[PDB]
Scaffold this active site. Sequence first.
Site, PDB file in Angstrom:
ATOM      1  N   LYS A 242       0.773  -1.255  -0.161  1.00  0.00           N
ATOM      2  CA  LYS A 242       0.013   0.116  -0.334  1.00  0.00           C
ATOM      3  C   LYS A 242       0.903   1.239  -0.119  1.00  0.00           C
ATOM      4  CE  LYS A 242      -2.894   2.704   3.325  1.00  0.00           C
ATOM      5  NZ  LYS A 242      -2.038   3.778   3.138  1.00  0.00           N
ATOM      6  N   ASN A 243       1.696   1.228   1.074  1.00  0.00           N
ATOM      7  CA  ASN A 243       2.598   2.396   1.339  1.00  0.00           C
ATOM      8  C   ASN A 243       3.795   2.693   0.418  1.00  0.00           C
ATOM      9  OD1 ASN A 243       0.688   3.548   3.012  1.00  0.00           O
ATOM     10  ND2 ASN A 243       1.472   2.898   5.097  1.00  0.00           N
TER      11      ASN A 243
ATOM     12  N   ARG B 222      -4.466   9.718   3.550  1.00  0.00           N
ATOM     13  CA  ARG B 222      -3.284  10.508   3.718  1.00  0.00           C
ATOM     14  C   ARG B 222      -2.606  11.096   2.508  1.00  0.00           C
ATOM     15  NH1 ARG B 222      -1.194  14.090   7.473  1.00  0.00           N
ATOM     16  NH2 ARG B 222       0.866  13.979   8.016  1.00  0.00           N
TER      17      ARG B 222
ATOM     18  N   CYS C  25      -6.212   7.633   8.294  1.00  0.00           N
ATOM     19  CA  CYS C  25      -6.415   7.200   9.319  1.00  0.00           C
ATOM     20  C   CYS C  25      -6.267   8.457  10.589  1.00  0.00           C
ATOM     21  CB  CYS C  25      -5.246   5.905   9.840  1.00  0.00           C
ATOM     22  SG  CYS C  25      -5.186   4.632   8.621  1.00  0.00           S
TER      23      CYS C  25
ATOM     24  N   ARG D 224      -2.161  14.459  12.831  1.00  0.00           N
ATOM     25  CA  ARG D 224      -1.289  14.265  11.488  1.00  0.00           C
ATOM     26  C   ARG D 224      -1.117  15.640  10.744  1.00  0.00           C
ATOM     27  NH1 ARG D 224      -3.124   9.011   8.740  1.00  0.00           N
ATOM     28  NH2 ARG D 224      -0.785   8.900   8.235  1.00  0.00           N
TER      29      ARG D 224
ATOM     30  N   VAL E 262       0.932  18.711   8.749  1.00  0.00           N
ATOM     31  CA  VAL E 262       2.025  18.439   7.518  1.00  0.00           C
ATOM     32  C   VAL E 262       2.796  19.619   7.355  1.00  0.00           C
ATOM     33  CG1 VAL E 262       0.177  17.058   5.898  1.00  0.00           C
ATOM     34  CG2 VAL E 262       0.167  19.784   6.224  1.00  0.00           C
TER      35      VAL E 262
ATOM     36  N   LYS F 125      11.783  16.101  13.159  1.00  0.00           N
ATOM     37  CA  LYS F 125      11.494  14.808  13.560  1.00  0.00           C
ATOM     38  C   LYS F 125      11.135  13.916  12.293  1.00  0.00           C
ATOM     39  CE  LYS F 125       7.285  16.614  15.859  1.00  0.00           C
ATOM     40  NZ  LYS F 125       6.131  16.045  15.809  1.00  0.00           N
TER      41      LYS F 125
ATOM     42  N   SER G 229       9.758  11.658   9.801  1.00  0.00           N
ATOM     43  CA  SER G 229       8.531  11.370   9.015  1.00  0.00           C
ATOM     44  C   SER G 229       8.788  10.694   7.659  1.00  0.00           C
ATOM     45  CB  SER G 229       8.003  12.941   8.754  1.00  0.00           C
ATOM     46  OG  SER G 229       6.793  12.945   7.882  1.00  0.00           O
ATOM     47  N   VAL G 230       8.030   9.733   7.714  1.00  0.00           N
ATOM     48  CA  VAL G 230       7.858   8.971   6.267  1.00  0.00           C
ATOM     49  C   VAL G 230       7.402  10.093   5.304  1.00  0.00           C
ATOM     50  CG1 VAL G 230       6.581   7.107   5.119  1.00  0.00           C
ATOM     51  CG2 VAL G 230       7.437   6.923   7.437  1.00  0.00           C
TER      52      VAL G 230
ATOM     53  N   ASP H 223       2.387   0.570  12.277  1.00  0.00           N
ATOM     54  CA  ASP H 223       1.090  -0.106  11.779  1.00  0.00           C
ATOM     55  C   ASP H 223       1.194  -1.290  12.004  1.00  0.00           C
ATOM     56  OD1 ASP H 223       0.586   2.250  10.336  1.00  0.00           O
ATOM     57  OD2 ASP H 223       1.642   1.834   8.362  1.00  0.00           O
TER      58      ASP H 223
ATOM     59  N   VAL I 203       4.443   6.924  18.074  1.00  0.00           N
ATOM     60  CA  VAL I 203       4.648   7.375  16.813  1.00  0.00           C
ATOM     61  C   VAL I 203       3.300   8.292  16.746  1.00  0.00           C
ATOM     62  CG1 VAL I 203       4.686   6.971  14.367  1.00  0.00           C
ATOM     63  CG2 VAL I 203       5.961   5.780  16.006  1.00  0.00           C
TER      64      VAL I 203
ATOM     65  N   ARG J 228      -8.988   0.016   2.463  1.00  0.00           N
ATOM     66  CA  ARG J 228      -7.937   1.024   2.033  1.00  0.00           C
ATOM     67  C   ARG J 228      -6.530   0.454   1.864  1.00  0.00           C
ATOM     68  NH1 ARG J 228      -6.879   5.626   5.805  1.00  0.00           N
ATOM     69  NH2 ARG J 228      -5.811   6.501   3.918  1.00  0.00           N
TER      70      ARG J 228
HETATM   71  C1  LIG Z   1       0.407   6.825   3.150  1.00  0.00           C
HETATM   72  C2  LIG Z   1       1.336   6.294   4.311  1.00  0.00           C
HETATM   73  O1  LIG Z   1       2.469   6.079   3.878  1.00  0.00           O
HETATM   74  N1  LIG Z   1       1.118   6.191   5.525  1.00  0.00           N
HETATM   75  C3  LIG Z   1       2.124   5.830   6.503  1.00  0.00           C
HETATM   76  C4  LIG Z   1       2.844   6.892   6.817  1.00  0.00           C
HETATM   77  O2  LIG Z   1       2.379   7.954   7.400  1.00  0.00           O
HETATM   78  P1  LIG Z   1       2.997   9.403   7.328  1.00  0.00           P
HETATM   79  O3  LIG Z   1       3.711   9.954   6.312  1.00  0.00           O
HETATM   80  O4  LIG Z   1       1.719  10.285   7.650  1.00  0.00           O
HETATM   81  O5  LIG Z   1       3.770   9.450   8.901  1.00  0.00           O
HETATM   82  P2  LIG Z   1       4.872  10.279   9.448  1.00  0.00           P
HETATM   83  O6  LIG Z   1       5.999   9.395   9.708  1.00  0.00           O
HETATM   84  O7  LIG Z   1       5.066  11.423   8.676  1.00  0.00           O
HETATM   85  O8  LIG Z   1       4.387  10.497  10.896  1.00  0.00           O
HETATM   86  C5  LIG Z   1       5.236  10.473  11.984  1.00  0.00           C
HETATM   87  C6  LIG Z   1       4.833  11.281  13.229  1.00  0.00           C
HETATM   88  O9  LIG Z   1       5.092  12.954  12.768  1.00  0.00           O
HETATM   89  C7  LIG Z   1       4.382  13.718  12.762  1.00  0.00           C
HETATM   90  N2  LIG Z   1       4.181  14.402  11.730  1.00  0.00           N
HETATM   91  C8  LIG Z   1       4.517  13.973  10.088  1.00  0.00           C
HETATM   92  C9  LIG Z   1       4.446  14.789   9.308  1.00  0.00           C
HETATM   93  C10 LIG Z   1       4.515  16.449   9.372  1.00  0.00           C
HETATM   94  O10 LIG Z   1       4.588  17.121   8.696  1.00  0.00           O
HETATM   95  N3  LIG Z   1       4.499  16.850  10.699  1.00  0.00           N
HETATM   96  C11 LIG Z   1       4.666  15.778  11.765  1.00  0.00           C
HETATM   97  O11 LIG Z   1       4.632  16.448  12.695  1.00  0.00           O
HETATM   98  C12 LIG Z   1       2.839  12.770  12.733  1.00  0.00           C
HETATM   99  O12 LIG Z   1       1.812  13.535  13.240  1.00  0.00           O
HETATM  100  C13 LIG Z   1       3.349  11.475  13.396  1.00  0.00           C
HETATM  101  O13 LIG Z   1       3.071  11.695  14.665  1.00  0.00           O
HETATM  102  O14 LIG Z   1       3.834   6.552   7.829  1.00  0.00           O
HETATM  103  C14 LIG Z   1       3.245   6.258   9.011  1.00  0.00           C
HETATM  104  C15 LIG Z   1       4.465   5.784  10.073  1.00  0.00           C
HETATM  105  O15 LIG Z   1       5.119   4.562   9.816  1.00  0.00           O
HETATM  106  C16 LIG Z   1       2.226   4.985   8.845  1.00  0.00           C
HETATM  107  O16 LIG Z   1       1.793   4.761  10.007  1.00  0.00           O
HETATM  108  C17 LIG Z   1       1.541   5.107   7.718  1.00  0.00           C
HETATM  109  O17 LIG Z   1       0.748   4.279   7.424  1.00  0.00           O
HETATM  110  C1  LIG Z   2      -2.342   5.065   9.192  1.00  0.00           C
HETATM  111  C2  LIG Z   2      -3.420   4.520   8.368  1.00  0.00           C
HETATM  112  C3  LIG Z   2      -3.152   4.553   6.691  1.00  0.00           C
HETATM  113  O1  LIG Z   2      -1.866   3.620   6.184  1.00  0.00           O
HETATM  114  P1  LIG Z   2      -2.772   6.217   5.781  1.00  0.00           P
HETATM  115  O2  LIG Z   2      -1.403   6.950   6.633  1.00  0.00           O
HETATM  116  O3  LIG Z   2      -4.028   6.980   6.374  1.00  0.00           O
HETATM  117  O4  LIG Z   2      -2.653   6.191   4.536  1.00  0.00           O
END
Ligand SMILES: CC(=O)N[C@H]1[C@@H](OP(=O)(O)OP(=O)(O)OC[C@H]2O[C@@H](n3ccc(=O)[nH]c3=O)[C@H](O)[C@@H]2O)O[C@H](CO)[C@@H](O)[C@@H]1O
Ligand SMILES: CC[C@H](O)P(=O)(O)O
EC number: 2.5.1.7
Lengths: 418, 418, 418
Positions: B22-23, B91, B115, B120, B122, B160, B162-163, B305, B327, B397
């Site tokens: 998915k991701n 997302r 989710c 969350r 950006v 921090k 962030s994926v 996850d 996380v 999803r």
């Molecule tokens: C579509 C997708 O790929 N989804 C995955 C992706 O989500 P996603 O990319 O949203 O996750 P992030 O690693 O960015 O989030 C990590 C932490 O950093 C915070 N944060 C993130 C971005 C930002 O601009 N600011 C900020 O403060 C988030 O709120 C969270 O607390 O990685 C997550 C962490 O493995 C997985 O659970 C999700 O399934």
């Molecule tokens: C955390 C649940 C899902 O993988 P999304 O990050 O919303 O696509």
Amino acid sequence: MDKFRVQGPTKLQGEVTISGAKNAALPILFAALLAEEPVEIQNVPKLKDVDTSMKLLSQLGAKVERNGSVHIDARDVNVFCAPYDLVKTMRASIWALGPLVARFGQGQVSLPGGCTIGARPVDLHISGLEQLGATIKLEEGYVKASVDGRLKGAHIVMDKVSVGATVTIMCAATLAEGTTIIENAAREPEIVDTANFLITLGAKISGQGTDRIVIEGVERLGGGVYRVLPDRIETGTFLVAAAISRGKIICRNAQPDTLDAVLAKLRDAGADIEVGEDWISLDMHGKRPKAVNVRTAPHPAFPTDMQAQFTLLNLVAEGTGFITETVFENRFMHVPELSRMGAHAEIESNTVICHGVEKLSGAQVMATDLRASASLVLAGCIAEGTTVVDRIYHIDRGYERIEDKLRALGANIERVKG
Amino acid sequence: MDKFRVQGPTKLQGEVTISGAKNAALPILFAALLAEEPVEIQNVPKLKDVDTSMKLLSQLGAKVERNGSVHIDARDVNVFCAPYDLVKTMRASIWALGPLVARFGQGQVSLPGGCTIGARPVDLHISGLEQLGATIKLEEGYVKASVDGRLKGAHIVMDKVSVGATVTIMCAATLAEGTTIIENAAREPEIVDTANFLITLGAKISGQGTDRIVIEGVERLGGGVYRVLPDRIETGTFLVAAAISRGKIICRNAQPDTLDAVLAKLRDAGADIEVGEDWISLDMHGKRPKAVNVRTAPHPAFPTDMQAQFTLLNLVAEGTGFITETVFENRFMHVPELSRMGAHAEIESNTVICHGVEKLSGAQVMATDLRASASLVLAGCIAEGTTVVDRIYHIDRGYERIEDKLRALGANIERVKG
Amino acid sequence: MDKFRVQGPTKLQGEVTISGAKNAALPILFAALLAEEPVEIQNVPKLKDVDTSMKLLSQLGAKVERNGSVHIDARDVNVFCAPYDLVKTMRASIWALGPLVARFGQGQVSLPGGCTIGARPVDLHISGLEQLGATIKLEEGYVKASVDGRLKGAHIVMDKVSVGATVTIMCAATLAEGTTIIENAAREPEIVDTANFLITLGAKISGQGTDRIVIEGVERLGGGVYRVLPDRIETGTFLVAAAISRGKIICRNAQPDTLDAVLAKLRDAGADIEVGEDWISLDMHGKRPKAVNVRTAPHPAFPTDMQAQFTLLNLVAEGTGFITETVFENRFMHVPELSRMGAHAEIESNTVICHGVEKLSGAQVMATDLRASASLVLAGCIAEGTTVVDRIYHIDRGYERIEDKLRALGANIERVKG
Ligand SMILES: CC(=O)N[C@H]1[C@@H](OP(=O)(O)OP(=O)(O)OC[C@H]2O[C@@H](n3ccc(=O)[nH]c3=O)[C@H](O)[C@@H]2O)O[C@H](CO)[C@@H](O)[C@@H]1O
Ligand SMILES: CC[C@H](O)P(=O)(O)O
Ligand SMILES: CC(=O)N[C@H]1[C@@H](OP(=O)(O)OP(=O)(O)OC[C@H]2O[C@@H](n3ccc(=O)[nH]c3=O)[C@H](O)[C@@H]2O)O[C@H](CO)[C@@H](O)[C@@H]1O
Ligand SMILES: CC(=O)N[C@H]1[C@@H](OP(=O)(O)OP(=O)(O)OC[C@H]2O[C@@H](n3ccc(=O)[nH]c3=O)[C@H](O)[C@@H]2O)O[C@H](CO)[C@@H](O)[C@@H]1O
Ligand SMILES: CC[C@H](O)P(=O)(O)O
Ligand SMILES: CC[C@H](O)P(=O)(O)O
């Protein structure tokens, strides 16, 4: 800090007359900033929030006066900056921003207070107003809005359900050029009431109570007379008061269709309910409630503003009941206060798991927000001994004369200085 | 609202073929906005999020088609405003913003859904893009980005881990002038996959999978063919399915090195695991799991996850196990749903304390997010009686054909309208 | 990651000399950016945060040196952009922004780190500085502030109580034109200390320690010598160390009036306390504490920075005690770590319900933030067996030589690499 001193146990029985809705009176008072002739708003509760709104309104240049009604003459509004000290004390102050912009082309409102039951952002109000053509910036703590000329109506899909942002957009739309469509609109009965007020003034609105409202802007709104609908949450609270106290009540000046979900849940709890056109009766036939499951959600589902109250019902009911709060992220502050009175609750995530006990004990507890406070007073009425609810000013934001109303049902309550 | 009706207990045994991640599929689909010749993306799961992304892509002007692969021709992108109705559902829609800016000099994307497991924000995506030279404002609900000319590469230390923001910056950097260095980069295998996709197209990238990625911008990216790596979380979920059900499984089309932490934890729970080059087998030898302790963290530590899934394993395991989620701040919503099935959990802060029971009971439960939903279906498979998982659309999803895959292992599942 | 290895049980008895306050030394160090002649700050603890601040200060162009004192010559500050890598490691870095703006007309500071015990926004700092005349934008992760010419003093009603934003506004006001009034000012003893430092330099300030501070701006501040007040939280921690360990201690170089609420609560717990002018003694007379109730609030109420410590006291006390945290929304992370040591706590909302046990057990636990870490080390001292507290670097942010101080009271502690 006034406190309530309560002595239980006491059974609550009798009748009560429901006041106008807090949460309809409030948006209507602010909507009256649109009016260019005098307005009379009937059946307005005497609440702290209403007093503050009238003062806020007056500081913008309105002429305001009240008795059973509030009279507003808004013709000469000439200040567009809302008074910060008034704004911070309540949620509803956010609603000055929309009308000031729509009618005068500018407005400045600091971030609201109100119930400390979440972060409570105002981004959807700001997004909505921008979609209607406003320019917005946050500066010195104020939300500062402007537009050159009229707003322009837009098709606005609300990102999430929101009572307050629905009101903001609907109200501001009444003086924009063209047509506004609000999709995913909140359906609460207070938005219907607000909408029907606006229509009295000459607004062109349809769809209120559904998930889509359509507004056609007009050049000016007029004046009028409008009566605020009954308070559904005050209704539900008094129905819970009788339900938990093994009692019976009739609620007069009520509107039973605003309570479908609540009444069903009260039937699930074992209550004998009847309804007429403008009244609701509840009888427990002497019995202790049964536990229920509840999940809060926007209207017409089970309301977040009855969640605290049903928390308490489940904690003196027979059985295990699960209450899930989905609307606000910090609305379990009443729970540990209840645990101080001997309750058996456990919180997991957004859910309180409740195992009802036969009796609570009196305790010194503290009100954190309006509906938690009411809940803790009700707890005090059925608890053994004395309860002192501290910080009871919270209650006066949403209940007119709660002490008097409960007294009339048999409660032993005292209001005490500090 | 479709629901799953599940009948247990059932043991889960057999084999399953893992779909593409998915991701990884998601960031690659959006990265393809960079491509100026056609692209073929192989091993793309059939997921709600993939369908929506293809539709979103098509609305920007891409030509998009799929079968086992998704074909994207992005040469004629000519709309830079992403469709709000599609963006709010997931997302991954955030990833349209970066490529639109890097290639076209502008883009407008509203705030994502996905989710409901935290606020969350950006902000790190926006900060990153600004560091590369973009101008950004939030207005009407959109993140509106622009730059005159190319972006310019920068040395960016991520505040921090962030994926998603790692992907945004890495992707946008591919068409900036000069060199970008991302420090404190996320190391997830999906960022490696994304990076290797980009390189297929002509990008100059090194360091993916480490905490620092270096990108040298090029003038244009081309086209190509690329196969998405297996889904590690779908893998882990099926391994948990067999582990909790006292079973055994082989997982085909797997990549075992993306699961070090998970597999170790499954060994701690008593599982007999073997791995080959592209498969993983688990055998419990008929036994109930042992409780484990887990702390989530970014890759290559134990993944958030898989947290919900391991919550369930600990709740039917032997012993007390502690699961700490670091996380996301609202990712215990599955817990009270599990408690409705007879589980013994307690939450304290960011930790669920789990005391395993031998058997769960069937219950009406509700899915709150993708991994919670999968977890509740697995619970239903081993529980006594019937479970109905409401709001099962969440599962679609992230899992292709979960019902079919589980059915093939022995589950008794029905998908039901409402 | 250094860890502490602790062996208990051990009783803690003896004396300790209190260091200067972390949280006064820090705002004073940043306030010294205002100074246009050299400054000597005496009684400055050796803490990670102090080291980082000196390095940050030096990178702006200050000449900085320390021993028992920190010497700062700020005359030649000539960089206004604070180093990000230093700023992210602590809260206090936010305080570079105010003085840089007030003295130089510009400053750029990224968002702070520090204790992960809430979202910890800086909006009141930004609002305050804007009210004084600054223009502020958030861009690339920095808070970027400017003003043409001097700031101008203003009447500022703080929307909520905030220690740090009180310091920011008070400090920046010292070089504005005219008079600033801060209403709803924080009253913490560290703001008094800061204020008295500023006055040494030539500032015109009155009202510090009350809810209103008045500042009249001057053209320039000078230099001077100032001694930082004792650390109240380090004091309280060592008093708790003796209280939970059935001991007795004298605390030297203390300031007992900064601890009214804490000392009263320690008397409620059964402690025999005496105070002199610059010392505090506690004796438990061999007894186990009694449980207490606590509610945190701003000074002079019971401090949030002693909450973790009192959590532990209640968990080995006799009875049930309720601890309500009102100041920060994520400051119960120590709780599950304590539960790993055999504690009986339950969290409900903002309250930990504690049922004291006679003894804890040794466990592998992990420090999440400064005061949680100290608490877990104290737990390890009275627990049976070995405790390993991981991530002990947190402690060094706020305690000079904790290991040595505790060792001197009888503890068996080892610092270990990893
Ligand atoms: C579509 C997708 O790929 N989804 C995955 C992706 O989500 P996603 O990319 O949203 O996750 P992030 O690693 O960015 O989030 C990590 C932490 O950093 C915070 N944060 C993130 C971005 C930002 O601009 N600011 C900020 O403060 C988030 O709120 C969270 O607390 O990685 C997550 C962490 O493995 C997985 O659970 C999700 O399934
Ligand atoms: C955390 C649940 C899902 O993988 P999304 O990050 O919303 O696509
Ligand atoms: C004065 C008044 O009428 N108060 C009522 C009103 O509050 P209020 O109008 O504030 O409630 P909302 O419906 O707007 O809030 C719904 C949810 O949406 C969020 N949200 C809201 C606005 C926004 O711009 N952004 C946003 O994200 C809120 O944080 C909350 O989580 O409806 C609530 C929901 O029935 C009731 O509990 C309140 O008693
Ligand atoms: C370096 C330092 O001195 N640290 C101390 C300081 O932190 P600090 O100055 O950060 O604490 P604050 O008093 O400002 O925080 C109070 C509350 O207000 C909120 N808030 C604060 C600022 C703002 O702009 N916006 C806002 O909303 C915070 O999120 C918190 O919920 O006081 C805290 C309260 O005693 C102590 O725990 C910290 O150890
Ligand atoms: C939620 C409590 C009150 O109704 P408010 O929304 O603050 O007016
Ligand atoms: C709350 C923990 C620390 O005192 P900080 O405020 O981060 O310096």
